[PDB]
Amino acid sequence: LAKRIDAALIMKDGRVVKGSNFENLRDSGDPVELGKFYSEIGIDELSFWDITASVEKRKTMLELVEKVAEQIDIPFTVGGGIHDFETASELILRGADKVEINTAAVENPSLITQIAQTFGSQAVVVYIAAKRVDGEFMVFTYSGKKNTGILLRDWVVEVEKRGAGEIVLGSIDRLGTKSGYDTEMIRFVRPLTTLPIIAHRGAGKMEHFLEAFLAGADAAKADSVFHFREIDVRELKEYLKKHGVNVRLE
Numbered sequence: 001l002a003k004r005i006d007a008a009l010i011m012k013d014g015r016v017v018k019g020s021n022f023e024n025l026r027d028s029g030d031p032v033e034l035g036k037f038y039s040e041i042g043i044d045e046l047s048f049w050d051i052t053a054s055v056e057k058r059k060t061m062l063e064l065v066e067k068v069a070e071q072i073d074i075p076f077t078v079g080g081g082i083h084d085f086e087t088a089s090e091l092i093l094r095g096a097d098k099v100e101i102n103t104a105a106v107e108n109p110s111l112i113t114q115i116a117q118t119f120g121s122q123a124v125v126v127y128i129a130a131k132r133v134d135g136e137f138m139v140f141t142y143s144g145k146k147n148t149g150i151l152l153r154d155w156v157v158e159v160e161k162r163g164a165g166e167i168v169l170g171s172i173d174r175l176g177t178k179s180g181y182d183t184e185m186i187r188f189v190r191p192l193t194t195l196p197i198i199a200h201r202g203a204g205k206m207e208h209f210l211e212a213f214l215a216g217a218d219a220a221k222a223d224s225v226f227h228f229r230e231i232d233v234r235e236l237k238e239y240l241k242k243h244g245v246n247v248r249l250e
């Protein structure tokens, strides 16, 4: 398929954490208005990742999904503390196209299969946060706090066997950097799975998107580079098409 450009919005209490620099918006911290804008300038998919407090979280995530589904017409995912099938199901039914799961899937891989049984593999995105430890790629849970001791190589294979539709490869080694996506990590995973690979963490300039697609990613996800306008989405898409990448333009 065409390569995909994804914008991720981190949220809390219904607000975009740290907003954005788009002065043309009524509320640059409103996820619906920001995501609608991205959908108009060439983002292919939106991912919303929620970190609100336990009490208000479930109702907050459902309201977000509901509000997004009304105004936005591109596919979108939702994630952040989705721990079980009933939570994932109610978010998809309320309007999300896919859910992103990480820690809960590592602790119970059958959760992938559960969700896929009812909603299809295409509704299940497994986010894999990985880091080099003593020379080997290991899987981390709990927002990067826990080395599971599971090898990336092994978790990828299991994720596909259990029925996931896509994998996000979040390189903890690149969090908060602008040096590029972890293309070595992407290239290590690419031969192990037939699933779409989404690159995450490290992007700082448009060239990094090209590098990740050459490494074998099928989609590239980023957030702050777009929200703080270090990279313009339509410039990025024109750049990638110029250099031979099959992306979608208007």
Ligand SMILES: N#Cc1cc([N+](=O)[O-])ccc1O
Binding pocket: 008, 009, 010, 047, 049, 079, 100, 102, 127, 129, 143, 144, 168, 170
């Ligand atoms: N997608 C995604 C995503 C995942 C995590 N995470 O597994 O901490 C954090 C932020 C994100 O945007």
